[PDB]
Design a protein around this ligand. Structure first.
Ligand SMILES: *[C@@H]1O[C@H](CO)[C@@H](O)[C@H](O)[C@H]1NC(C)=O
Ligand SMILES: *[C@@H]1O[C@H](CO)[C@@H](O)[C@H](O)[C@H]1NC(C)=O
Ligand SMILES: *[C@@H]1O[C@H](CO)[C@@H](O)[C@H](O)[C@H]1NC(C)=O
Lengths: 241, 98, 48, 48
């Protein structure tokens, strides 16, 4: 299956506050209007330079993730999961076993079977989306909650992706896995590339709109003028080689 | 036995802070952000978390202290030229300065 | 508009390293020995 | 005007890299079999 990611997947390049300047950045973003490879409720997916993960559900069935570089044995591997409550993060080099799909009443225990020289620990009608980046041994996560009414389609709209956490674990992730909670008796995936954007701000809060100034000629023209409004005339944007 | 790896440093010593001062020309250092200016409390709120606000011409003008989470304002320390007003050396020697 | 734009692109040029280690002086000042930091400071001074 | 004085300000002190179970520990090991407890992301108070 395939769908179109209209204007989703926008996070904050840094922690700076900007009142109303219409700022132009250059970083790794999800391109506007691209295919997402949406699934149903799940093989391994390559983690090239960062991914956009989104989920649409009405029940708490979607669960954490597993990352790594070989996904076979004896290597550094992220592992973020979640139980009924108190989200636990377990990020170490170990012999991760398999893909532990969760099995539901509250009786859910099939996670792992191996323990070795761990290095880190942590214990703590809706749309949830995440962005993962692996830069200089830092793992950054951005998250946002959005209430929805339709669940069979990706909604139209804009929302910034406020930063969640960061981890200093040096690792070179290349693939990852996802976890569900199938009972016993729909998640979106997209990749992101180096682009240039025109994030807005409103001096009373956060980003309200953005334009990807590499999509169509108006995007290039707006990006040149550094404004969202273009007056009648002819504008010289770039060069053709 | 300390060790140095390509992974970012994680175990590092503590940094001695100091009690901030307002309404004076000081040399500030907030988690690397340095410079000088008069410190003043802000009338603006960043977010549930933001470190330092900038503006057009990418100048740092608003930061929050990482002990009380209060946003402060940075204004450049006073500078300007001095001018000498004279009626002429032959006329007199009184001088007014601007 | 022209005067403001020129005066704005003037002060925006202060965040360019001109091939040196960094744009800020107070970091190249307190992260290198003076004798070689002279080269970086000069290379930044010329650009400014 | 000139800067009255220089000020530095940093966040609160987090987990203090527990050394009490390494120095003030009860029972140590023998030489031919020595421990290798490794510290991790925290603040080390070498002044004490
Ligand atoms: C997604 O890929 C298919 C072919 O695999 C293509 O027909 C479709 O136009 C693509 N979607 C977008 C939004 O370009
Ligand atoms: C804008 O700020 C005003 C106060 O300055 C506040 O009442 C209002 O809720 C803000 N708008 C938002 C948060 O959308
Ligand atoms: C300036 O001084 C000279 C000699 O000191 C004098 O002759 C002349 O009248 C003076 N002129 C004025 C305007 O004071």
């Amino acid at each position: 299956a395939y769908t179109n990611s209209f204007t989703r997947g926008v996070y904050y390049p840094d922690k700076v506050f900007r009142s109303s300047v219409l700022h132009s950045t250059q970083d790794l973003f999800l391109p506007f209007f691209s295919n997402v490879t949406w699934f149903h409720a799940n093989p391994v997916l390559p983690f090239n330079d960062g991914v956009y993960f989104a989920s649409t559900e009405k029940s708490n069935i979607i669960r954490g993730w597993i990352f790594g570089t070989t996904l076979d044995s004896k290597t550094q591997s992220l592992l973020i999961v979640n139980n009924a409550t108190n989200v636990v993060i377990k990020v170490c080099e170990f012999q991760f076993c398999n893909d532990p799909f969760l099995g539901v009443m509250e009786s859910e225990f099939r996670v792992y079977s191996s323990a070795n020289n761990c290095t880190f620990e942590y214990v703590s009608k809706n749309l949830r989306e995440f962005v993962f980046k692996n830069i200089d041994g830092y793992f950054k996560i951005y998250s946002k909650h959005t209430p929805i009414n339709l669940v069979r389609d990706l909604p139209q709209g804009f929302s910034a992706l406020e930063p969640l956490v960061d981890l200093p674990i040096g690792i070179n992730i290349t693939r990852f896995q996802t976890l569900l909670a199938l009972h016993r008796s729909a998640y979106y995936v997209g990749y992101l590339q180096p682009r240039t954007f025109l994030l807005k701000y409103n001096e009373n809060g956060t980003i309200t709109d953005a334009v990807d100034c590499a999509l169509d000629p108006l995007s290039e023209t707006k990006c040149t003028l550094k404004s969202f409004t273009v007056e009648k005339g002819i504008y010289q944007t770039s060069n053709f080689r | 036995s300390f060790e140095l790896l390509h992974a970012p440093a994680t175990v590092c010593g503590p940094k001695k802070s100091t009690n901030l001062v307002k309404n004076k020309c000081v040399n500030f250092n907030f988690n690397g952000l340095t410079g000088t200016g008069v410190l003043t409390e802000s009338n603006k709120k960043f977010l549930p978390f933001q470190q330092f606000g900038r503006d057009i011409a990418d100048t740092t003008d608003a930061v929050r202290d990482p002990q009380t989470l209060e946003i402060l304002d940075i204004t450049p320390c006073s500078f300007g030229g001095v001018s000498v007003i004279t009626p002429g050396t032959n006329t007199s020697n009184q001088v007014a300065v601007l | 508009n022209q005067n403001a734009q020129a005066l704005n692109t003037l002060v925006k040029q202060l965040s360019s390293n001109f091939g040196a280690i960094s744009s800020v002086l107070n970091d190249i000042l307190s992260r290198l020995d003076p004798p070689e930091a002279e080269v970086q400071i000069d290379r930044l001074i010329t650009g400014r | 005007v000139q800067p009255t004085e220089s000020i530095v300000r940093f966040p609160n002190i987090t987990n203090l890299c527990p050394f009490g179970e390494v120095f003030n520990a009860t029972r140590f090991a023998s030489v031919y079999a020595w421990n290798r407890k490794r510290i991790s992301n925290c603040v080390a108070d070498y002044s004490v």
